[PDB]
Specification:
Chain D: GO terms for molecular function: metal ion binding; small molecule binding. The complex is a heteropentamer of chains A (183), B (783), C (56), D (208) and E (82). Chain B is mainly beta and 783 residues long. Chain B is built from 6 helices and 62 strands. Chain C is 27% helix and 9% strand. The chains are: A alpha+beta (183), B mainly beta (783), C alpha+beta (56), D mainly beta (208), E alpha+beta (82). Bound molecules: ligand O6M and zinc ion.
Chain lengths: 183, 783, 56, 208, 82
């Protein structure tokens, strides 16, 4: 139902573009009459403008936003909720204490995957970027996201770990069976 | 397809927990005992303990606490199972009718969160404001205790301290306050937090964090007027309460770790402390009355009372009587008296309760290697009739030698490194009290092979192995074309510098004229974990290699073939030319010895992650496994492509609820098993039709038989690990089906209602109560 | 000695010196135990932003 | 703490878990050289490690104006040679003119599929373009664990949809370049959260 | 010119992807290698980040050296390149 959400569903048997195929190369059969692909989108641009309009106290002094950086803070598979932090470079007039200034802020937003509906959980204070470069601000922003996830880091079970493998490694370990492959 | 039936021969005997309180009536002083899944309720009467009722919970009892919220005339019981089933139970008696009411229940498991190292901890606030649960690292679960609401909405609070050792709720606090010992890279520390039900968060604790002893292992919440907390370590005992900080470092406690405590006096003036060696102490809190009415703690004193069984838990009862709940030995009722006896002890045993656990090995009528340390014994079980043979040291392995009319028992005793040259024993035991003894050629564990008479169980001979040599495996058999029967021992060299064994021996002994003669020795480059007679050859597993040895006419072991694809080949079982290999970390595998090839052939392997405890061959095509998560599983050859034949399928799954250390050989076959809790069970095979009838009967019994705490039987017996949860398959709970004979006649008719089904090799029956009574009665005769 | 004067709930308890419970079809409950579904980080941020909303 | 002292504790406690053997050294160490097939020496595979169950060991190929990527499944059996099970062509009908930093991931409970995230240091067009970056993501089905009734139905040397499908997608990201967060992106089984710098897309692939 | 930096005094749970996210906004990175313990199976707390541009690496050091990432003050410096 909302304008910020877009959902697409496609079925197969023998927005982002999908080149669904078999192990050989055949592009299968794209139809809606088996494989099931789902695509739930969340437009950052819409969310930012919506949260500033209704949930930012400083919303009246806002002019326009420039770049934005989205860092996921939490994924709850039981409640199907994605907690995203929205780093934002914007233009706004200051308090009556004008002249338009560049500021940086953080917008925490909870995104429901069952409904597709987002909810705002935090609106940051407008902090001035005085002669700090674009890289300076995004580095400090991400550093705060890292800081938070580490602060709230609760150890997960053995069996619920996301395995991540990459080689540009001395040993390939099978932790659970205390087996190493020495390279 | 494989169909199995599991039934209990002997219920668990080890005591995991015990609490005192007023559960049955406000007047009755009760004793509640937890024996794994079993809850025993007693009334402390003039005669001792009057049993009230024993209830089997559909779960391993992890938390057992009595509490009285305001408005209750009697204490309510809180129980949490190993599967995270939480319940508040109320005892109700109406004349001769007895009922255990489930006041509230639910599962308090989290999908996130990893089980904590020091396990599930369950604490109740003194003012019954809430229940505190430490289930996972990083999280503290709080169940609010509100009586005027449909649901008890439990919540998690983040704990920065990811490694908590022990926690308790403090007394005399305006705000519910937890006091806990935690570990971090800077050591161990004691910290407090106030618990806010309104904000669903922690607030700054009443007193500052204090640094504690490196091995500070338990917290004691001292009641009013003292208040505060006692922290017990390896070398010290401290008291903390805001301003106050008392510390005693008594040398008495240094030798052994204190592992249990029990409040004697309601005001916390005296506590009983039990250590790993079975020593019993009295912790004394000396008070000072203040003029403002309050009482302050002036000093701490510990005094040794005597010796009891190695206590898992202690509970003071009434009139100087203490219940000693033992896990490694027999449970006791001990009397405390002010006048010391002949040895100077203030503790006198009143009663002894047989505990078969841990069954670390057994023989077949049944002979087990029971208990550990000073509680080490042999137990002879037949038609149940139990005979106990005290060893006063750890029995490890047992084997029977019919031709010598004796048993071979591997055992270990603790000796201490003193001011003098070598080491000396602390207590007399089987290995030091044998009729005759020998020593090998060419604190610490001293390993021995004991020759014990099959009739008297007298220690005929004790052979001591080399300095730092551990005896791991044992067989009694005849090898090759040699007519003689030998006691074969597999060893490992355990040094106080290295972690993994890189040296060991296979030693062939012959017992004759009351003495043991070393026939042959074979050096290995690792630990000889398991050995099995295999078609007149010796099958042995050294670290990660399974090896076949031939016995020459020259009385020597000659290696024939090797299989190297293992991580830790700990368990071996054979049937004909087939070998079932059990790995500590890599599930199971099937090998085949190829006689005309003189080598092994890797037939099939179970590709499932499983940390094995024991294995057994049911038949040529069905293999039984028991793992670390207390489940049983059955592997079958996939019944075709070579890759498909190389894959063992787990066709049977069942949550046993016990840790199996040994398997040994209507229904077909009898595999008896020994567990850590001293429970003894039987596994047997069923036909497809027998299974189908008994499974329908289980579903019908579950609709009629009620569960305490409202735990579903199906949930309880579901195969469960940290990786997966699956409903039990191809397994019948014999205990559940046997309970049909114990239900009333009107309830039997509702169970067998519109039941015919029964396809006894062909067509359908028409089942009555009497038809099934005859079925269940024949099944009770299997054990 | 400090082993004299042990607790006495009743003197008539040790001076002198179990049936299986098969719950028959009978089920009267009272309450259920449930766990808070919502994440602890979300709950906290919800809690802090709702306190900022109260800040009049 | 000696392994045998640790093992004895197990027998009398019934407490056997990997988070107890945590501090002890590996039980088995085998060199890659002694388990790798000699015909794959000239191939130049890049070994990635073990799948969550110790059954498989994965590797990739960065074969060559354009680059072609391949994902391999090797059957592991401690000292035995690795046996090749599955070889798939990553990022179908996609011409990559720069060597990608690829990462193979696995879901918490779903052992049916794997995800391959490959990205270049900076996008192109021939000439390196500083404002863009190319993200390539492939969802590949893992080989069947045992005998499969649907797989048995074959006309050539093959695999059913459940145990033999592939999914491909490509997207351009802008400054600040979105962070790679593999643990959160795959926290929900069968969903990949993809930050396209303009939107976050929830991608669910499931076979019924 | 091409410059390589030394990043140290890091929290052991800081990932290569986290380091990439923190350093990437200053300029293009050719390579990042966070040093891992073979025996622990966890970060050593140090690594090397190689920017395509020397002036971009200079600003990354100026803005990140001595500043706390997860409570630990980060040590960003230069390297031999000889
Ligand atoms: C802020 C942040 C959080 C998490 C990850 N990666 S992750 O999702 O794989 C993850 C999640 C939780 C803990 C760990 C660990 N150790 C890893 C990040 N990668 C780059 C980031 C930036 N800036 C970043
Ligand atoms: Zn298939």
């Amino acid at each position: 139902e909302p304008g910020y959400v877009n959902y697409t569903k496609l079925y197969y048997v023998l927005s982002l573009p999908f080149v669904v195929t078999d192990l050989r190369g055949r592009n299968l059969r794209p139809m809606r009459e088996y494989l099931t692909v789902e695509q739930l989108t969340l437009d950052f641009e819409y969310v930012i403008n919506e949260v500033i309009r209704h949930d930012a106290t400083w919303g009246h002094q806002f002019c326009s936003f420039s770049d934005y950086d989205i860092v996921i803070l939490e994924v709850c598979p039981e409640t199907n909720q994605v907690l995203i932090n929205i780093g934002l470079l914007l233009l706004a007039f200051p308090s009556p204490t004008l002249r338009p200034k560049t500021y940086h802020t953080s917008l925490k937003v909870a995104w429901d995957l069952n409904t597709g509906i987002f909810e705002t959980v935090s609106v940051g204070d407008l902090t001035e970027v005085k002669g700090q470069t674009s890289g300076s601000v995004w580095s400090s922003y991400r550093k705060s996201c890292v800081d938070m996830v580490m602060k709230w880091l609760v150890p997960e079970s053995s069996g619920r770990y996301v395995n991540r493998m990459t080689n540009e490694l001395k040993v390939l370990a099978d932790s659970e069976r205390y087996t190493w492959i020495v390279l | 397809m494989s169909y199995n039936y599991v039934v209990t021969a002997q219920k668990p005997t080890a005591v995991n927990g015990c609490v005192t309180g007023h559960f049955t009536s406000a007047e009755d002083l009760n004793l509640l005992i937890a024996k794994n899944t079993r809850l025993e309720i007693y009334v402390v009467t003039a005669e001792g303990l009057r049993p009230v009722k024993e209830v089997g919970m559909y779960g391993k009892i992890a938390v057992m606490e009595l509490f009285r919220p305001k408005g209750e005339s009697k204490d309510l019981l809180f129980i949490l199972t190993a599967k995270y089933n939480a319940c508040i139970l109320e005892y109700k008696q109406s004349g001769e009718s007895i009922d255990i009411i489930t006041r509230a229940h639910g599962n308090v498991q989290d999908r996130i969160g990893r089980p904590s190292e020091t396990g599930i901890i369950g604490i109740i606030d003194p003012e019954c404001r809430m229940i505190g649960l430490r289930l996972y690292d990083g999280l503290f679960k709080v169940i609010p205790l509100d009586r005027d609401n449909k649901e008890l909405k439990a919540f998690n609070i983040r704990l920065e301290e990811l490694h908590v050792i022990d926690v308790k709720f403090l007394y005399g606090c305006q705000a519910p306050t937890i006091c806990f010992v935690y570990q971090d890279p800077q050591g161990r520390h004691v910290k407090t937090y106030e618990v806010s039900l309104r904000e669903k968060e922690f607030n700054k604790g009443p007193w500052k964090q204090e640094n504690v002893e490196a091995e500070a292992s338990m917290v004691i919440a001292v009641p009013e007027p003292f208040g505060g907390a006692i922290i017990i370590g390896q070398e010290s005992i401290t008291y903390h309460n805001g301003d106050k900080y008392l510390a005693i470092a008594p040398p008495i406690i240094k030798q052994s770790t204190i592992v249990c405590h029990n409040r004697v006096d309601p005001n916390g003036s005296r506590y009983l402390l039990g250590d790993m060696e079975g020593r019993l102490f009295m912790l004394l809190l000396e008070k000072e009355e203040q003029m403002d009415g309050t009482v302050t703690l002036k000093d701490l004193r510990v005094e040794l009372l005597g010796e009891t069984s190695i206590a898992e838990c202690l509970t003071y009862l009434d009139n100087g009587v203490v219940f000693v709940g033992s896990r490694l030995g027999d449970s006791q009722l001990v009397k405390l008296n002010v006048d010391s006896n002949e040895q100077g002890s203030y503790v006198v045993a009143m009663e002894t309760f047989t505990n078969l656990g841990p069954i670390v090995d057994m023989c077949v009528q049944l002979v087990t290697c029971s208990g550990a340390f000073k509680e080490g014994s042999l137990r002879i079980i037949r038609n149940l009739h139990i005979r106990t043979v005290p060893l006063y040291e750890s029995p490890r392995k047992i084997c029977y030698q019919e031709v010598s009319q004796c048993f071979g028992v591997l055992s270990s005793r603790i000796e201490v490194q003193d001011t003098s040259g070598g080491t000396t024993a602390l207590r007399p035991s089987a290995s030091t009290q044998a009729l005759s003894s020998s020593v090998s050629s060419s604190e610490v564990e001293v390993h021995n092979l004991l020759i014990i008479d099959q009739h008297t169980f007298e220690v005929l001979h004790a052979h001591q192995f080399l300095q730092n040599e551990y005896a791991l495996s044992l067989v009694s058999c005849k090898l090759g074309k040699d007519p003689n029967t030998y006691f074969i021992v597999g060893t490992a060299m355990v040094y106080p510098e290295e972690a993994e064994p890189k040296q060991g021996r296979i030693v062939v002994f012959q017992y004759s004229d009351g003495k043991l003669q070393t026939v042959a020795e074979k050096e290995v480059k690792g630990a000889v974990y398991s050995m099995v007679e295999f078609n007149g050859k010796l099958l042995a597993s050294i670290n990660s290699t399974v090896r076949l040895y031939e016995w020459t006419t020259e009385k020597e072991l000659r290696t024939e073939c090797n299989h190297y694809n293992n991580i830790m080949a700990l368990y071996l079982k054979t049937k004909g030319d087939f070998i079932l290999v059990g790995d500590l970390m890599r599930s199971v595998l099937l090998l085949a010895y190829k006689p005309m090839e003189g080598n092994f052939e890797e037939i099939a392997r179970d590709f499932n992650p499983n940390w094995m405890s024991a294995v057994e061959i049911l038949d040529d095509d069905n293999f039984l496994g028991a793992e670390n998560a207390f489940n049983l599983f059955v592997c079958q050859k996939d019944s075709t492509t070579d890759e498909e034949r190389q894959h063992l399928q787990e066709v049977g799954l069942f949550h046993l609820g016990e840790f199996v250390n040994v398997f040994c050989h209507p229904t077909q076959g009898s595999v008896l098993f020994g567990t850590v809790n001293g429970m003894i069970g039987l596994v047997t095979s069923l036909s497809e039709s027998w299974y189908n009838l008994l499974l329908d009967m289980q579903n019908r019994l579950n609709k009629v038989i009620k569960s305490v705490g409202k735990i579903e039987h199906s949930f309880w017996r579901s195969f469960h690990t940290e990786r997966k949860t699956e409903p039990a398959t191809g397994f019948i709970d014999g205990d559940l089906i046997e309970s049909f004979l114990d239900i009333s006649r009107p309830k039997m008719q509702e169970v067998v209602a519109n039941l015919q089904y029964d396809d006894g090799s062909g067509m359908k029956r028409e089942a009555t109560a009497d038809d099934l009574i005859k079925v269940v009665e024949e099944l009770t005769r299997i054990h | 000695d400090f082993l004299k004067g042990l607790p006495v709930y009743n003197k008539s308890n040790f001076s002198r010196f179990p049936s299986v419970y098969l719950p028959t079809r009978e089920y009267p409950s009272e309450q259920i135990i449930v766990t808070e579904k919502t994440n602890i980080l979300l709950r906290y941020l919800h809690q802090q932003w709702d306190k900022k909303n109260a800040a009049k | 703490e000696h392994v045998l002292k640790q093992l004895e504790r197990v027998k009398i406690s019934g407490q056997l878990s990997p988070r107890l053997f945590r501090k002890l050294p590996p039980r088995v160490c085998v060199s890659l050289k002694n388990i790798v097939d000699e015909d794959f020496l000239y191939a130049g595979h890049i070994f990635l490690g073990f799948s969550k169950c110790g059954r498989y060991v994965l590797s990739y190929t960065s074969s060559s104006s354009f680059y072609i990527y391949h994902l391999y499944w090797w059957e592991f059996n401690v000292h035995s040679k690795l046996k090749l099970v599955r070889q798939v062509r990553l990022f179908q009908d996609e011409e990559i003119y720069s060597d990608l930093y690829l990462t193979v991931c696995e879901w918490p409970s779903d052992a049916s599929k794997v995800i391959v995230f490959g990205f270049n240091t900076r996008s192109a067009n021939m000439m390196s373009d500083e404002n863009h970056r190319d993200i390539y993501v492939s969802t590949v089905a893992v080989p069947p664990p045992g005998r499969c009734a649907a797989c048995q139905d074959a006309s050539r040397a093959a695999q059913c949809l459940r145990h033999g499908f592939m999914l491909h997608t490509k997207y351009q990201v802008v400054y600040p370049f979105p962070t790679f967060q593999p643990a959160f992106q795959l926290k929900k089984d069968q969903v990949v959260l993809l930050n396209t710098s303009y939107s976050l897309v929830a991608c669910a692939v499931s076979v019924h | 010119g091409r410059m390589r930096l030394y990043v140290g005094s890091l929290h052991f749970n800081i990932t290569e992807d986290m380091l990439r996210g923190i350093f990437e906004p200053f300029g293009r990175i050719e390579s990042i290698q966070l040093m891992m313990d073979s025996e622990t199976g966890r970060s050593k707390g140090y690594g090397f980040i190689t920017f395509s541009d020397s002036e971009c690496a200079k600003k990354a050091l100026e803005q990140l050296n001595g500043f706390e990432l997860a409570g630990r003050p980060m040590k960003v410096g230069h390297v031999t390149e000889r």
